[PDB]
Symmetry: C4
Subunit: 351 residues, 4 copies
């Protein structure tokens, strides 16, 4: 009997082949930030208010115009068909059924349209401004046609972080899986090898402004841990900021997103929504993020680990667990809406 979200990592570690579990579970180098992404939540306590009528909890929120059932969303991860045959189809169905947003990786094993064919649902598309700006365009288009509503642009990955497990595992994408967003596209004449060499080391904020010249979809600038870049993201025309450290997969010894969050929220000055991912496993984590000023969180690994465990039902139970846990956190904190989740409902180390 699985009772918390973290237990799916343990199950996925048993069930998956080492190189796949590692590929997902990996953080950069000595995985300090990966641990810190979890540990830092445990250095924030609650300051609950009691004896408040919490019989009607509303955790529903609006994200870039779209109403969703909870401030708990799915972050993009690569190649989900290594975890489970359905892969991103199951994620889409689960995310649609949960009434929340799913971000799809450009490195997904299922295309935007494949995911869209599972049924209606609000979905964002994770991108890099790759070197081949025509390929970036095609992807964007492909996403717009598939009914995707925003672009989570990765901005902390001019180069890939050193996840040493992969080198030690000789990590190769399995035989019958492809990066389906790049299939059928004009690449200018191995696809994983292609996209890896396509990650652009030269990106500036002008390239974020450029991304806005090829799509009218709101741009979530994804991977901002500093108030300095939080400011620049607003000025660059970002629809929102995801305080992400790429699941601690890029630069290690970068702060946890929870430490980083409040600096970014304040720097954004309410001009745009500030989301978080990295180390959210508990409903208490969701709350803490929101009390620090986040507009909602994404989960990455729990989706792939639970997908690996129980398929769609695994992702269903992760969203449901986080939901129930978060509703209970709200109840036991005295919060009947997300607006009622205030800074005074928590205390951090760094107060």
């Amino acid at each position: 009997e699985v009772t918390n979200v973290m237990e799916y990592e343990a199950i996925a570690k048993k069930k998956l082949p080492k190189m796949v579990f590692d590929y997902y579970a990996s953080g950069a180098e000595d995985q300090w930030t990966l641990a810190e992404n979890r540990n830092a939540f445990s250095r924030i306590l609650f300051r609950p208010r009691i004896l408040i009528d919490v019989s009607k909890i509303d955790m529903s929120t609006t994200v870039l115009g779209f109403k969703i059932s909870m401030p708990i969303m799915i972050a993009p991860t690569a190649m989900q068909k290594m975890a489970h045959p359905e892969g991103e189809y199951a994620t889409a169905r689960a995310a649609s059924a949960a009434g929340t947003i799913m971000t799809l990786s450009s490195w997904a094993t299922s295309s935007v349209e494949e995911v869209a064919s599972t049924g209606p649902g609000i979905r964002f598309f994770q991108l890099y401004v790759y070197k081949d700006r025509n390929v970036v365009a095609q992807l964007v288009r492909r996403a717009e046609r598939a009914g995707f509503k925003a672009i989570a642009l990765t901005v902390d990955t001019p180069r890939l972080g050193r996840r040493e497990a992969d080198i030690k595992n000789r990590f190769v994408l399995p035989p019958f899986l492809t990066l389906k967003n790049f299939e059928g596209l004009d690449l200018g004449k191995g696809l994983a090898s292609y996209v890896a060499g396509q990650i652009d080391r030269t990106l500036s904020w002008k390239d974020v402004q450029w991304l806005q010249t090829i799509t009218s979809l709101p741009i979530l600038v994804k991977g901002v841990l500093t108030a300095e870049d939080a400011r620049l993201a607003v000025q660059a025309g970002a629809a929102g900021i995801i305080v992400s450290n790429h699941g601690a997969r890029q630069l290690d010894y970068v702060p946890s997103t929870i430490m980083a969050l409040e600096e970014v929220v304040k720097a954004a000055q309410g001009r745009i929504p500030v989301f978080l991912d990295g180390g959210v496993r508990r409903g208490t984590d969701v709350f803490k993020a929101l009390a620090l000023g986040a507009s909602g969180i994404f989960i990455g690994r729990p989706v792939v680990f639970s997908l690996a465990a129980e398929g769609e039902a695994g992702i269903k139970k992760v969203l449901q667990m986080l939901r129930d846990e978060f509703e209970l956190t709200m109840a036991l904190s005295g919060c009947r809406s997300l607006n009622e989740i205030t800074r005074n409902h928590i205390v951090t180390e760094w107060d």
Copy 2:
């Protein structure tokens, strides 16, 4: 040979069935606060005064008018007949013999009158303002008739905390045990299932004020970790405040009651007594609580664990150990009365 209170948990873990030990030992979720309830005592040091005549130690105190032999009382816990055949009878006899107060859970396996039939003793009755306000009335009445002197109203449990062991253990109350306070009552036509669905998610402070319209017994508002609600408890007409985090069984990542205590004591402004429970195992813990300004502490789990171990004699030895340990702490601190236990006799992390 058992020499400290904590050793009864180890013995109870060996002796009990997993689901019963867990049921009692459980904290909410990743049991962070459960650990913190103990660990936080170890981040408070003593500042003992020496060469004071400590041959006559008086630890006797008065709690809501009633003289007791020590500021160490028994907190309410559910269904003690899972731990040991005698259950709450043994707790009552032990608490009477120790000359201290016992709080009985509404979820006890023995009724208020059953407990009262063991002999004379000062006893409080733990309650929820359940949805069926008529049932709450009957319980209150039943307690008053049984010679119970106060109501510890639980106020941090509009919904039950997620103690995952129970879900993983498929926790069912054993065959011949019942919640005896609810037996013989008009329930308006499984009792554990009933009372679980009776925990009221809608309670406000008006319902605390309502509890005072059906009993003249002093109301200990139980589960206040904030100065904000400490203030509201005074204004609501509480006879006292128990700084409790429900043995870390409700919201996890709530502060330890020892961190929380001093904020609550100060907020109460001496208008009412402020008690503590959660993580008291040592006489040094009792002292530390008292030096932070508590009027006395309750112990929960040590009672059920020692009951599980050695029956009544186990609870006898827990009270006696805590007593002797606390008398010695007082001696070695230079404190010959509870009034002589001052803030300057300790130092915390947070000074």
Copy 3:
């Protein structure tokens, strides 16, 4: 090959019977302060000065008028003949040979005169102001006749701390050992049982002043962790203060003597010398104590553990190791005398 002092504890644990090792090694309750006595040294760093001629290191000091070869002395411990047949004879010979002071416990297995018969040496006598003030007198006399030069009066032990190992081990003094300072004395008509019941719970500072009416020997008030009592010790007529926590054997959760030291040194205002014991195993510990303002340290357990290990040679090597280690600490810190050991040569957590 034994290379540090701590290694003698490991050897003594192997070699001794459990109840004897425990008796010595025991701290009070959950042995928090016992650990802290060591750990706290590791939260003080050095601020060494380099390129200073350290070819001539003088660690010689004067303690209550007596010149000694180093600020590293032997603290009193009970019944050393449980550790090794020679017991306190070996300690005396070792302490004489090292040119340092040895404090003898009133609970020693060898009398003051027995110890004195090993040869010349500077020695202090540890006392309690026991209930039978005539017995205290006789002991004092006995010490003066044996050529003992000061009284280390224990002042943190109105009652014995709860060292649980002893209760769990059913700790009895071996058959042919006695408390030899009490042998041949008028006890007013088991000796361990006697002296245990003689520890006086009523002592005030007036009884310290009383001790000064029966001896002209300087009184080291032993067991002061507070500036408040450091002040009172000066006013009471103490020749010095030993910042001791009874090897963490009395009140647990009392601060380490190293945290406590600087508060006591400052409170004493240079009027009297302030010594330390508790958790000194390294020459770096000796330095740190001295830089915090101590006039010298005592070691307790290392003496009995090394005695248990290698007899007199064990205590010889402990003193020699601490010495060499301390000379090297002095060299590598830039300190050629104890006067040159300054506060700026260290940094603590609490600066």
Copy 4:
């Protein structure tokens, strides 16, 4: 597959004889500072700037006039032929090929000229001002003739630190190895025993000034952890300061060089370059050192451990790994030159 620098320690521990691994791996006493040299890097986080064109990273720097490919250099270590037959030859070839500086120990198993015969390369010579000032002269000369460009004078070793493993291992230099810098020199009529007795306990800053009377080569004063001595090093005529704690091999409980670094950099006031060694294993460590104001770092043990592992190729891969890791740290921090590595790119505990 080796993926980080630390993994070479594990391999060297397997491969080497205990006394050799220990000899190298040893820190002083309880190896607190040795751990701290690593651990302290993990208490400094990054504050990366994103979306900066990092396609052209320049980590090239100038050290005492000499252009080198990176701010990552080789610290001197003794007797490298115990690790691997080639020993310091392999280090020289690797350091030449990496386009960085190698410091050679006076206690090397290969002479300055032997090392110089591997091919061209920028190299410093580590010295003690030994008691026999004529021997120091000869060494200096020997280094100048071998094309060595600076003297790293050790200044934290008036006496050797107590590395207990060596005493426990009965550490002897193997049969056919010698301290080749002392071979062929006029010693005034065992060489390891000789040089050990030659370490001068009397050195002052006047002896640093004296070293400058026998060579015009720039003097790196090596082993300064204090602003006080950082100041004195400038005044003494040092070409630079290496904030080193002798790989935590001298005084234990000395601060990590990373804690110490910023105090020394500020005290030097930009008058001379301030380098660091001790606990650099990651490119992130290199960055952190540089952001604290270091002009470049040296690595000691990784060279001998990787030499022990894979010979020259091992040292090649350590330099290459640190390089690649450091280039990536620079990329992911937004730093395209070492000048662009600023204090604001990190945050420590002690800010």
